[PDB]
Amino acid sequence: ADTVYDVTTWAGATVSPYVDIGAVINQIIADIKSKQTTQTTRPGAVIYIPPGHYDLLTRVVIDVSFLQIKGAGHGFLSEAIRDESQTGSWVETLPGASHIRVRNNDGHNEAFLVSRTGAPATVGRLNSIVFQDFCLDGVNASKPYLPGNGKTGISFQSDNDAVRIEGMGFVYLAHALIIKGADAPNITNNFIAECGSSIELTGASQVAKITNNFLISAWAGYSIFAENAEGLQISGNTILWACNITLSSGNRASITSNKLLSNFPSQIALLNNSSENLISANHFRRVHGDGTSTRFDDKFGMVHIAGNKNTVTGNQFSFDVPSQNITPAGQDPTIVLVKSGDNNYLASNHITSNVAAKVVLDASTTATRVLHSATTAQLDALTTNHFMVATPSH
Template structure:
């Protein structure tokens, strides 16, 4: 009977898993290739990583479907706090559980690369690859981590279907996760921190779910960045430090019930032709704990910036808590929402607190914007006559 379940510590590899877990997993995958040769008999494999510390010298390359790599816990520890502290009395100073240290000596940047050389039209898409319950540690890094070492935790570089990344930990990476051309991927229950960017959806993704994660990115990147996404769901996440979602030419996406905390503007940035997106029920808190670092956007950029057509921004709470002396440019009246371009966008039923001096700004090219029960008329700064405001009662 074909073997389908493997343990990296007991598989008869050419090196111990603690020495180079990447090489061990590649040898397991080579055996799966050798044993599963028919189109109709490819059940895939489960590769188990027991608790322990494992060095990864060789990038893992996955080019088959139905592979699950799973550990026994994300084992996260804040390495930035560790590296800025006196740890003499600490009980532990390394991440735990199933802990992989990315030390690539093969010249590669990724810890895990999911890629098939043949095009999807020739060989089909890669289906149902899963990463669960272990931590990928870039070992050393300095803020803002991007471009930094260039290390990537998981890079799904071929069009894929039903990829799952669940219960994972990521730390000290330039980018934790990259998914290209993802269809119906689930990214849920992960803890990614002290990374330049946490999740990048490149190419044209559709119906990806990003839910219940804790994502902590530095000012040079974003917690979630998506381009040409259709139907993306970002829900129930905690997005901190530069708590941000950057959508570039995305449509019919839902950004709902998230907690955003950021020291910089641009907490939701809809860039280019972003149409029919729903931004609802989120808590946005703008603070300034690192005014010496600059992400290129000042307080006129907007906590939320909207471009495109028929977008709805509703039922959000915007809490702006930056002292006047720390605003950029100096003494600026902060922009809460900037409608930069597009038509028929709706801002409805939102609440602004933390400051009495703020603006909703409509740029000159915008048309048909409706602002309903969100702010007083005096808070609207419109460079167009083509809008309707129903002020707070």
Template sequence: MSTVYDVTTWTVPGNPAVTCYTDVGAVINSIIADIKANQPNQWSKPGAVIYLPPGDYPLRTRVTIDVSYLTIKGSGHGFTSSSIRYNSGDTSSWWEIWPGGSRIRVENTDGRAEAFRVARAGNPRLSSVVFENFCLDGVSFTGNQNSYRNGRVGILVDTANDAFRIERMGFVYLERALVVRDADALSVSGNFIAECGNCVELIGSGQASKVTDNLIGAGYVGRSVFAEGHEGLLVTANNIFPRGASLIHLKNTNRSSISANRLHGFYPGMIVFEGLNKENLVSGNHLRREAEPWGPMQPYGNGRDDLFGVIQIRGDNNFVTGNMIAWYVDPTKIRPVGATPTMVLVASGTGNVVATNHMVTNVAAKHVVLDATTVGTRVLDSGTAAQFQAYTTNHAFRATP
């Protein structure tokens, strides 16, 4: 029994006309059926590897994964910018214009949104599924190539899962690149995920997972990294670049760390906490906020003004410390017109701490602002008295010496 499959040599039983060059989705589904047929023993299901050699493969049928211990891997994430291509006009002199490597073109004609849907009811939950080192290319944002809308999803993990890995992948021009529900010990590491409406969405709930060492950049309509209901999430050492509506967005997430990331954004709200978030650490990040410099994208934005904060915190006992915010925006582009921009806004919650952050701005700014509903916030060495604004008396403040 073989447990290593090559999509270029697989023949679909009863339908040899279907190949990886006509519909790689149908081929992978056929391989998964073979894996299940050859591993019926409850006591011995080692799983398998499905290999995608470098090449272009159209996916017209959604792949459904309902087995554990499956690795789907290629030999090159193949990312290249599609936004530059679509906004360049004449590309006739370019060396190449499309993503390469082991590239799957997401062209679903089966009425499904996802290239891969991973789901299984019953027990145990799916475990140890790996996506590694190939490209998922949504090809086009039909109609308006700057819309980030085409309804296409790269990978949807739709039921509880354990120890999944998404590593060294390339995702481009998908409305939603990676969506994982109810993750336990998930690793999203070393990927290139950009020019997608949303890049990484961890939904439902999760624990002890990590998003590390990725190159990420969502569109203005979505989020680069979003997590809800998570406990102990690690978001570390990512290079997150424009132009996400938010770069890191936590919702009802506790005891998690956002640390040592480099964040570059064109809009307010680069790090956002939504709902009730407790005991999270935001530490050692480098944030650079500018206005959109590129003509084709200047008409777009995320709908927030500069009073929203570069970092906005909601929840209790969160710690924002040791971050660098470099804010350089032409005064004529500040919104509302004439406003004094906010760097860190504590919008709600009790017992939050903002300490020893360094902020450099080209205009007068409020380094830390406390909304009226906040209680017991401590602001230490993160700005002068003139750079601090509190709409509550229930706080402690120590000015930067």
């Protein structure tokens, strides 16, 4: 069929894909649109990227539904370690597989912009676009990569449904993946590392599914940021270095069965009246020194709750920070800060810390339940309006 392209064999390109794969992909998209021209004759296409090193100089703009862009793997190599190492004898010094080097010279910061102009009720949303098994690489960057090199890997900026980002590698980008106005996106089995932020669901979203990823962005941004987000599912992920899952007016999320590690506070922040979110069966680890920051002090919380009726159950909170590094100086660090809200619920969580640490209930909070989720020594209730069933202690 004529719906399958390989960027290196397609004879219609005016430029080499190794020199500018963005131009080649834009030219393929123009070809698709010249062939798929009515409401009922737009099934989409496959663009395959074989293993190779490809510069992108021109931003790709996608407004075609059901486009699959697929390569041979995530291609990750730690450019952070490379850039602190003597690499003269390294067999390879670049990320690989189907490797796009994001090197825009066109005035834009995105490698891929997924955007349709026009009101979605009138022209339709962008549907079931698939990015699979290739590598997006910002080439050069310094920690913590935000503002960094200012490069974005994939940015969806118009309303979309059932999009899919799977098996990809993202490295040395200020923003790996940004999806605005996402409905049922699937972000699964990716390897995102040494990036300023990993996943940002902006504007609003419904029922995003974020599963089975490595997310290893640094301390100036977010591993997962989601605003006006209903029904987020975050599970099966390994989120490292500076794990920061922030919901801003996010509700009815299910954040379960993840391995969560940060060298900084705010592993999960439920902000701006984020309510009825479940945090269950996660391992939380707070350590210190892989980078340092004063973005947060250690009273912010490993988990920070500003909202109602959230549920925190069955987790481990493991905290190991030398006392001399804890801020504000002389203060006990906070495991969970219930900053504001009503009827939040903490049950059956195990707190293991190298120094005395606390679940803090702000004086404004009401009806918080803390049930086998803190010994008496681990609870700092600044209001009598709470219910405590202590974890047994001496």
